[PDB]
Amino acid sequence: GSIQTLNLDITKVSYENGAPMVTVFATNEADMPVIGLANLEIKKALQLIPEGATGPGNSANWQGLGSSKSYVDNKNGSYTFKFDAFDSNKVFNAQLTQRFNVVSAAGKLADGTTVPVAEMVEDFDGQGNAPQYTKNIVSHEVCASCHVEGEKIYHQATEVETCISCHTQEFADGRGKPHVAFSHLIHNVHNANKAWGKDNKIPTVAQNIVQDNCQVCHVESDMLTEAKNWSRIPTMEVCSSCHVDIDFAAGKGHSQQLDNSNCIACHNSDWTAELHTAKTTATKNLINQYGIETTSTINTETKAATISVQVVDANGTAVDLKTILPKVQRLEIITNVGPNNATLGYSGKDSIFAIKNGALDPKATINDAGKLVYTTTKDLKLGQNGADSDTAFSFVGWSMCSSEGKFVDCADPAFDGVDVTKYTGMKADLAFATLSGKAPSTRHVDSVNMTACANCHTAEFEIHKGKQHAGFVMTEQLSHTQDANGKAIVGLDACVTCHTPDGTYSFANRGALELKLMKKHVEDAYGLIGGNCASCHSDFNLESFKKKGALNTAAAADKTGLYSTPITATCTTCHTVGSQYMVHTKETLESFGAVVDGTKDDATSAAQSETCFYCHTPTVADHTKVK
Ligand code: HEC
Ligand code: HEC
Ligand code: HEC
Ligand code: HEC
Ligand code: HEC
Ligand code: HEC
Ligand code: HEC
Ligand code: HEC
Ligand code: HEC
Ligand code: HEC
Ligand SMILES: [Ca+2]
Ligand SMILES: [Ca+2]
Ligand SMILES: [Ca+2]
Ligand SMILES: [Ca+2]
């Protein structure tokens, strides 16, 4: 017995006896009543002091009325709370909005049914009817974009409304610590201008992901009537969380301000909203001005691929590349072979900067039809490694010079791409060709897609933008399949051009795509993701292992490549052999048909000999599952 989702509703609030009696109804995912909850609580009872009541320009704030763990299980899915010590401070005012924060701890019913954590708030007037006014600015869903839903965010709770219900102005005032008010703390912990906590943690990682982008948490909503407070209610307490060098009292960094009375007079909502979103809005507009449509064909005689790039405008109308060449900062074409198991490795792949700072490479031309045309020079070894090796796949990344939200001429032929304020990564593309002229093979894209990446990195993520690459913006341009609802899947299959089974530039980096994303995020995003496979995966495509060969897993002493059988390679990214993270010894893994950091030939020969999935039945919900 296990409940998937515990739903909680406050269905009745009665003040007929003085302190409120609060009834909560608990249901599961099938809307069935949940009887026997042992850890249900009113974590906070609050009332809302309205905007400006504590002084001109000041925020609304949640005044404390107490808490209760005293309830009766009514044996029908409902639970009725009483307060032993309601409103200890004697501040209860029936003219104010009343809030209850209800939490149910993860654990078990008597029958031993597992129950997950649940949290909610609901607001009422002072007689238990619907409320007359609210402070509804954000909703828990925005935090779940980046923080694993149902797990504690830092401490105490899993949903932002619970945080807000404890980290009040009254709480911060009572501790003599303005910074622990939630409206200060939330921006402070994602912004690197000052450290937080006893340890002076500098939020470097949070700053690099959030980038002060208000729209990752402040989202327009009909369900949130105070959503525009982020631009409409400027206060020194909140604005100082990132603007840490102003002293309003002393007029240092700013004209003196002794209260919040005049902030809105100068800091109008339009200006605050525009200035903090201007750069991301401008970049997004630049990215959406142009597209590319890419084709590739194989010469049946020479077995070279010819890649043709059509620039298009926002409407999909042809643009002759000659008209914008002076503003093309880079265009790169990377070609590999065998989309399900790349065969050329990193050193064998075909690659070219066809354009650099307005200059065509001599190997690339613009034809009379205004398309860029480039022919591979590397041996593509088409057809030399089974049916999959009939297909060449070419990834096109490009960038355009830009300044303050406008495209500009690339004025410097040697511009090295380090200063990312001087150009924009544009929409990348993927083109398939076959030697045989049959339909191309394509990689599966049904287990991970760019929608997952975009939850943390935004849809405008210019991947690898800098000295080495133009910046790859991943969109429906390189979609070749739809999901069961007919939505275009934006896959990471193009990334395999470089993220090959042989790795990237070094054999030591687990460069294979099957290893690299999981390696990077277990090392650098563990605080957000940990073991949460669902942060990237809708599914595991375990059938894909039947199309894989050896995967590079290490470098030998002499810098040559060591390889594992593919399931072992994939699991050992996190579960390092010989470490505290892997019970199976090397000898045991070999007993299950694996090659562990051996030769490419031994790993290739054994690649379909692994018995792992006889015992292991991993799902995204539980990757650890065994018979
Ligand atoms: C992605 C765009 C994010 C959204 C939306 C939110 N958070 Fe976040 N948070 C994010 C990162 C990358 C980090 C740094 C993690 C690290 O390992 O350093 C954080 C950090 C926090 C913290 C600090 C605790 C810590 O883990 O360092 C807290 C308390 C926090 N975040 C809370 C939080 C809440 C309540 C959000 C919804 C309003 C929220 N975050 C959104 C990335 C993102
Ligand atoms: C009371 C019931 C709490 C709830 C719910 C949450 N937090 Fe909390 N938090 C609480 C206390 C008593 C303290 C210590 C404050 C102090 O005096 O120093 C904290 C501290 C934090 C901090 C550290 C803040 C800083 O040092 O600048 C963070 C980052 C924090 N809390 C985050 C947080 C989040 C995201 C919550 C919802 C998931 C949350 N807290 C709930 C008490 C309470
Ligand atoms: C999530 C990580 C956030 C980002 C990024 C930004 N804000 Fe935010 N803000 C967030 C929360 C959870 C809250 C508390 C809401 C509540 O119900 O208490 C806020 C609050 C503000 C406020 C206070 C509004 C008020 O009524 O006093 C302002 C003025 C505010 N936020 C502004 C703001 C701006 C300008 C940001 C981009 C630079 C921004 N926020 C980012 C969560 C997050
Ligand atoms: C961190 C999440 C921030 C919060 C909260 C606030 N601001 Fe901010 N502000 C932030 C950044 C990263 C920048 C630079 C923006 C850019 O792209 O140029 C700003 C800038 C300002 C400015 C203009 C710069 C100046 O020198 O005046 C103003 C006037 C400004 N911010 C005001 C402001 C107000 C009134 C806030 C509370 C509502 C506020 N900011 C919060 C980051 C963050
Ligand atoms: C008009 C007379 C003002 C009043 C009243 C307040 N502020 Fe202000 N502020 C004003 C200007 C002209 C600027 C510089 C704008 C620019 O783009 O250069 C500012 C700047 C800020 C900033 C940003 C500081 C920085 O980035 O260096 C913040 C965070 C800020 N102001 C907040 C603020 C608050 C909270 C106020 C009421 C207490 C307030 N300001 C009053 C003009 C005026
Ligand atoms: C939030 C839970 C994340 C999801 C989902 C994905 N990524 Fe991520 N990524 C995340 C963090 C916290 C970091 C480290 C940031 C730091 O400052 O250290 C990363 C790092 C990357 C990098 C490195 C480049 C960078 O811009 O920092 C890349 C290239 C990257 N991530 C790509 C990426 C892709 C393609 C994803 C979908 C498979 C993906 N990430 C998911 C947080 C999160
Ligand atoms: C060749 C032109 C490449 C293409 C196309 C892509 N990547 Fe890459 N990536 C490349 C190298 C040479 C390296 C460094 C060596 C290494 O293997 O680590 C990388 C690195 C990454 C990383 C690690 C963090 C980082 O350095 O940014 C990640 C998470 C990564 N690459 C992801 C990735 C994705 C999602 C791609 C398709 C959108 C992609 N890369 C393409 C070389 C090349
Ligand atoms: C985003 C940062 C990821 C997280 C978190 C996890 N995985 Fe992953 N995984 C990711 C990518 C980009 C790929 C490559 C897809 C490709 O086309 O090669 C993978 C691949 C796997 C595979 C191979 C089978 C497949 O579905 O493609 C397995 C078995 C796999 N990943 C397992 C796995 C587990 C168990 C995770 C949680 C502990 C996990 N992944 C997280 C990106 C990310
Ligand atoms: C990093 C993205 C991971 C990859 C890739 C895989 N696993 Fe994993 N696994 C991971 C974590 C963070 C944890 C929790 C560790 C803990 O605290 O216990 C796990 C756990 C397991 C377990 C249960 C633990 C045990 O001692 O057996 C199993 C059985 C397990 N993982 C299996 C497994 C398999 C078969 C994988 C390849 C398909 C695999 N994991 C990849 C993180 C990651
Ligand atoms: C049945 C006879 C098994 C075969 C065949 C393989 N594994 Fe296994 N594995 C098995 C058990 C009972 C456990 C422990 C489960 C638990 O919850 O404790 C495991 C564990 C792993 C783990 C997790 C390791 C850790 O966290 O310490 C991984 C990554 C793992 N196994 C991988 C794996 C691979 C790659 C195999 C084929 C070569 C393989 N296992 C075979 C049972 C069995
Ligand atoms: Ca209700
Ligand atoms: Ca909830
Ligand atoms: Ca900070
Ligand atoms: Ca295309």
Author numbering: 44 to 670
Copy the relevant paper text:
For these proteins, a defining feature is close-packed c-type hemes often in van der Waals contact and arranged as approximately linear chains that span the tertiary structure. Shewanella MtrC has evolved to support anaerobic respiration, specifically to deliver electrons from intracellular respiratory chain enzymes to extracellular terminal electron acceptors such as mineral oxides of Fe(III) and Mn(IV) and humic substances. In the native state, MtrC contains 10 optically indistinguishable His/His-ligated hemes.
For this study, we aimed to introduce a spectrally distinct heme within the MtrC heme chain noting that His/Met hemes in their Fe(II) states have a broader, red-shifted Soret band than their His/His-ligated counterparts. Thus, we introduced to MtrC a methionine in place of the distal His561 ligand of Heme 8, Fig. 1A, blue. We were unable to prepare diffracting crystals of Ru-MtrC Met8 or Y657C H561M MtrC. However, diffracting crystals of H561M MtrC could be obtained under similar conditions as for wild-type MtrC, and the structure, resolved to 1.60 Å, confirmed Met561 as the distal ligand of Heme 8 with a Fe-S(Met) distance of 2.3 Å, SI Appendix, Fig. S2. Superposition of the wild-type and mutant protein structures revealed no major global structural differences, with a total main chain rmsd of 0.3 Å as calculated using SUPERPOSE. The rmsd of both main chain and sidechain atoms within 6 Å of hemes 8, 9, and 10 (minus the distal ligand of heme 8) was also calculated, yielding values of 0.2 Å and 0.4 Å, respectively, indicating no significant localized changes surrounding these hemes. A high-potential center (Em +199 ± 16 mV versus standard hydrogen electrode [SHE], error is SEM) was revealed for Ru-MtrC Met8 for which there was no counterpart in Ru-MtrC His8. Introducing a spectrally unique His/Met ligated heme at a site distant from a Ru-photosensitizer has allowed unambiguous detection of intramolecular ET within the MtrC heme chain. Transient absorbance has quantified rate constants for ET between the intervening heme pairs. The values, summarized in Table 3, describe ET between Hemes 10 ↔ 9 and Hemes 9 ↔ 8 with closest edge–edge distances of 3.7 and 4.3 Å, respectively.
